Enzyme design. Structure first.
Site, PDB file in Angstrom:
ATOM      1  N   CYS A   1       0.825  -1.204   0.000  1.00 59.67           N
ATOM      2  CA  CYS A   1       0.000   0.000   0.000  1.00 59.67           C
ATOM      3  C   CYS A   1       0.863   1.259   0.000  1.00 59.67           C
ATOM      4  O   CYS A   1       0.460   2.298  -0.521  1.00 59.67           O
ATOM      5  CB  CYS A   1      -0.929   0.004   1.215  1.00 59.67           C
ATOM      6  SG  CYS A   1      -2.590  -0.627   0.877  1.00 59.67           S
TER       7      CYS A   1
ATOM      8  N   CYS B   1       5.951   4.123  -1.591  1.00 59.00           N
ATOM      9  CA  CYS B   1       7.394   4.381  -1.536  1.00 59.00           C
ATOM     10  C   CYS B   1       8.068   4.057  -2.868  1.00 59.00           C
ATOM     11  O   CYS B   1       9.157   4.550  -3.155  1.00 59.00           O
ATOM     12  CB  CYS B   1       8.048   3.550  -0.430  1.00 59.00           C
ATOM     13  SG  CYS B   1       7.120   3.496   1.122  1.00 59.00           S
TER      14      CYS B   1
END
Length: 77
Positions: free
Chosen positions: A11, A14
């Protein structure tokens, strides 16, 4: 050289700063090893309160929203 940790992976968006960080961090004149931490046990251990935590050289400054390519260069330069 730069110890960069990416908490979340899934999720956690990054992925964006992940690629930008490697090139910029290394290109800036200092290689960096990016190791992902798929486990809150490791995430919280970092100190971040959000999911997409990003701790570098033992200092987390990104939480709930990975940094941007332009931000990296501006944060380091």
């Amino acid at each position: 050289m730069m110890k960069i940790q990416i908490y979340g992976t899934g999720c956690a968006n990054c992925q964006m700063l992940e690629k930008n960080a490697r090139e910029a961090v290394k290109e800036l004149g200092i290689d960096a090893e990016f190791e992902k931490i798929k486990e809150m046990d490791q995430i919280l251990e970092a100190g971040l309160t959000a999911l997409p935590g990003l701790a570098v050289d033992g200092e987390l400054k990104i939480m709930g929203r990975v940094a941007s390519k332009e931000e990296i260069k501006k944060i380091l330069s």
